[PDB]
Amino acid sequence: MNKLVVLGSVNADHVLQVPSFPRPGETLHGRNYQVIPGGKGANQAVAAARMQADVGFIACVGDDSFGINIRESFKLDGINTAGVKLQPNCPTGIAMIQVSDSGENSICISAEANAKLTAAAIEPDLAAIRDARYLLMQLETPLDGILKAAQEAKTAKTNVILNPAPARELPDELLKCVDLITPNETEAEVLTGITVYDDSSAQQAADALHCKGIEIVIITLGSKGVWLSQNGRGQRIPGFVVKATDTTAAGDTFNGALVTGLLQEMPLESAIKFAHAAAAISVTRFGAQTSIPTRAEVEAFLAEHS
Amino acid sequence: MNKLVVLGSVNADHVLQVPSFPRPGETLHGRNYQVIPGGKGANQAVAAARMQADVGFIACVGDDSFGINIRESFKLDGINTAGVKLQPNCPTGIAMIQVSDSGENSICISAEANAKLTAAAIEPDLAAIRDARYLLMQLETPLDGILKAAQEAKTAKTNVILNPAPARELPDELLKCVDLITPNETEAEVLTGITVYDDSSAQQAADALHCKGIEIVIITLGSKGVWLSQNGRGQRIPGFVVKATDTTAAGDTFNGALVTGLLQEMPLESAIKFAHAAAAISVTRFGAQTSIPTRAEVEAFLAEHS
Numbered sequence: 376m377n378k379l380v381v382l383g384s385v386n387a388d389h390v391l392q393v394p395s396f397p398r399p400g401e402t403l404h405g406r407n408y409q410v411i412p413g414g415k416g417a418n419q420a421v422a423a424a425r426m427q428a429d430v431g432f433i434a435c436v437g438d439d440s441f442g443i444n445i446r447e448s449f450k451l452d453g454i455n456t457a458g459v460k461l462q463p464n465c466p467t468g469i470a471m472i473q474v475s476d477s478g479e480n481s482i483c484i485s486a487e488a489n490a491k492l493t494a495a496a497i498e499p500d501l502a503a504i505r506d507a508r509y510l511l512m513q514l515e516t517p518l519d520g521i522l523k524a525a526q527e528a529k530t531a532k533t534n535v536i537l538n539p540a541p542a543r544e545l546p547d548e549l550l551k552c553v554d555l556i557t558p559n560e561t562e563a564e565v566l567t568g569i570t571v572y573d574d575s576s577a578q579q580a581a582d583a584l585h586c587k588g589i590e591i592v593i594i595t596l597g598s599k600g601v602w603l604s605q606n607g608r609g610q611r612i613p614g615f616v617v618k619a620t621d622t623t624a625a626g627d628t629f630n631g632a633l634v635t636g637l638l639q640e641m642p643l644e645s646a647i648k649f650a651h652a653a654a655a656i657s658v659t660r661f662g663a664q665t666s667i668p669t670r671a672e673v674e675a676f677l678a679e680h681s
Numbered sequence: 682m683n684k685l686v687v688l689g690s691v692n693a694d695h696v697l698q699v700p701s702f703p704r705p706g707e708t709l710h711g712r713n714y715q716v717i718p719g720g721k722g723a724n725q726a727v728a729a730a731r732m733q734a735d736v737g738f739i740a741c742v743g744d745d746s747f748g749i750n751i752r753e754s755f756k757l758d759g760i761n762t763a764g765v766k767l768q769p770n771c772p773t774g775i776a777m778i779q780v781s782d783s784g785e786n787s788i789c790i791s792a793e794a795n796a797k798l799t800a801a802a803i804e805p806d807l808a809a810i811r812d813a814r815y816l817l818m819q820l821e822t823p824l825d826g827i828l829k830a831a832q833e834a835k836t837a838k839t840n841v842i843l844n845p846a847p848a849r850e851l852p853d854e855l856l857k858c859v860d861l862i863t864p865n866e867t868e869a870e871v872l873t874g875i876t877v878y879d880d881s882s883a884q885q886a887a888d889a890l891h892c893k894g895i896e897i898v899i900i901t902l903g904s905k906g907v908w909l910s911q912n913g914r915g916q917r918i919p920g921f922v923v924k925a926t927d928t929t930a931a932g933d934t935f936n937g938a939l940v941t942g943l944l945q946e947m948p949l950e951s952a953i954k955f956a957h958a959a960a961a962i963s964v965t966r967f968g969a970q971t972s973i974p975t976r977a978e979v980e981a982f983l984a985e986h987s
């Protein structure tokens with residue numbers, strides 16, 4: 376029984392660099408086309424697995440070549456893929472990601488196989504959720520699946536970490552089941568209404584989540600580190616200073632590394648700093664999973680930062 | 682030896698249906714992810730083939746499963762794929778395509794294997810070009826290769842029809858060997874500077890190209906049909922009005938049909954009218970080659986319309 380169970384999405388990132396932002400009409404010449412394994416659930420389970428967590432993964436992929444292959448690849452990564460279903464006659468979820476040389480990114484996502492991860496779909500996964508010490512989830516799969524998983528986890532005294540990404544609002548009923556939540560600045564706002572300008576707001580944002588029943592709130596702040604509140608007692612834990620070139624799986628990495636630290640009986644504060652280190656590395660590399668570091672790369676990183 | 686030689690591109694079309702077109706800093710949600718036989722070169726060769734032209738295709742495909750597979754498919758449409766090269770360790774040209782409800786599309790292409798259709802690369806194809814009476818090309822393959830073809834055509838009584846798509850500027854050495862050019866409105870603008878907004882501007886653009894050596898100009902105007910000019914004598918030839926499902930390959934289908942009609946001794950005006958019918962049927966259907974009509978379909982449509 377995996378001590379960590381990650382539930383979440385799988386995309387194929389079709390990345391293309393384009394000179395201008397895409398507009399309808401004339402065929403625009405792109406370049407450096409790649410298909411990168413992505414998806415917030417996949418990226419986080421890959422994060423944890425690469426941080427050597429005892430991790431199983433609940434997800435829905437397609438029966439295209441990509442879905443068939445990425446499942447095998449997860450195995451190679453050390454992820455228990457028992458909970459990874461292949462959806463008949465569905466492509467795998469895809470992100471059509473056009474990186475514009477003029478900075479501004481064009482993103483077109485289609486759920487595809489991901490829309491299939493329903494509360495009923497995860498039924499055989501429930502037991503793995505009960506036996507886990509931690510359940511990690513995001514929001515790139517249907518809500519009923521996410522909610523069903525958290526509920527199962529509360530009664531089993533499994534700890535529930537929710538990375539509320541991508542940004543979307545959530546019912547009290549799910550928040551109440553979440554032991555630890557890790558929104559970024561955008562997502563805390565969406566979830567609370569409270570926009571996070573500084574410590575005061577971050578703490579109000581946090582307290583709003585504490586009142587939704589979430590003991591621990593971690594608001595990731597981009598380069599500003601993290602705002603950690605545990606039972607009202609808040610504090611900013613800063614991250615590392617790196618030349619950021621792509622932050623695509625940054626948040627995915629942080630959550631994977633964070634939960635792996637806690638499973639190693641790290642104090643929360645230390646687990647967090649550890650996760651900072653992993654995510655920092657990732658923000659320095661291109662693409663989703665292509666940027667997610669190993670435990671070795673992290674220890675190496677931490678050593679080099681003294 | 683084929684009477685018509687089409688030289689141009691092959692792409693896998695990665696196609697998403699979108700509610701609308703994406704705003705710069707925002708995540709579009711798409712659907713019906715599909716990978717579709719495409720590329721202007723293939724589209725027009727497929728179009729001429731289906732119009733029962735005697736057509737050989739000069740193109741480059743990759744050695745991925747897609748390129749191997751599509752080249753075979755070309756045979757099934759009666760295309761002589763002798764000149765269709767398989768390029769090792771290169772994926773096939775791709776297009777990332779979003780099609781909205783309106784039938785509008787944004788297309789981003791990645792050349793990939795198409796970048797291998799060089800002048801040197803088409804050396805074995807020069808005989809087919811000389812022995813043809815018609816050479817039809819577009820612009821998704823290297824310019825040096827397009828140029829070379831146009832030149833070998835003129836030495837051996839071979840009419841050149843250039844379809845200057847996607848929009849880019851062309852050297853005069855190319856244009857003066859073009860017997861008949863078929864820009865859309867964006868391309869006409871890019872080629873002459875003269876935006877085409879009406880009858881007069883349509884003629885300004887056209888005579889610009891006549892002073893580039895091109896005897897016959899055809900400016901396509903979407904649903905407004907085309908503008909036809911034979912040495913300073915322009916006129917608008919209306920297309921047929923259809924509801925647009927997807928307009929990906931309307932112009933490709935038009936070019937394919939047009940050249941075939943001409944080839945089969947339809948007077949210039951009849952060939953255009955013929956081509957209009959093919960293209961109008963095509964904009965009613967989804968995806969690139971998936972939408973290209975049969976000859977019987979076009980006759981039927983022509984018998985209906987009339």
Ligand SMILES: Nc1ncnc2c1ncn2[C@@H]1O[C@H](COP(=O)(O)OP(=O)(O)O)[C@@H](O)[C@H]1O
Pocket residue numbers: 386387388412413414415418470472482484540541622623624625626627663664708
């Ligand atoms: N706007 C987006 N840009 C890039 N990837 C996205 C986006 N939205 C969802 N994804 C999916 O989730 C993963 C990236 O995480 P994300 O949180 O979007 O990064 P960011 O820090 O830019 O918000 C990718 O693998 C991709 O498949």
Ligand SMILES: Nc1ncnc2c1ncn2[C@@H]1O[C@H](COP(=O)(O)OP(=O)(O)O)[C@@H](O)[C@H]1O
Pocket residue numbers: 558559560595596597598600601614615616617619622623624625626627629650651652654655658
């Ligand atoms: N520019 C950066 N420099 C260093 N670390 C970063 C940077 N951006 C993100 N991080 C790290 O990535 C983690 C993810 O947080 P955040 O960037 O808010 O998520 P997301 O990028 O998904 O919005 C942060 O807690 C931090 O550890």
Ligand SMILES: Nc1ncnc2c1ncn2[C@@H]1O[C@H](COP(=O)(O)OP(=O)(O)O)[C@@H](O)[C@H]1O
Pocket residue numbers: 865866901902903904906907920921922923924925928929930931932933935956957958960961964
């Ligand atoms: N909405 C439409 N209805 C009918 N025919 C069309 C339509 N759009 C394009 N065509 C046909 O395709 C040819 C060129 O169209 P094009 O300029 O490429 O339009 P678009 O770029 O919007 O597809 C014309 O011959 C015309 O017959």
Ligand SMILES: OC[C@H]1O[C@H](O)[C@H](O)[C@@H]1O
Pocket residue numbers: 402690692693694718719720721724775776788790821929930931933969
């Ligand atoms: O003309 C439409 C075609 O142009 C682009 O090259 C795409 O592949 C698409 O299929």
Ligand SMILES: [Cs+]
Pocket residue numbers: 621622623624625657658659660661662663666
């Ligand atoms: Cs990254």
Ligand SMILES: [Cs+]
Pocket residue numbers: 926927928929930931963964965966967968969972
């Ligand atoms: Cs079409």
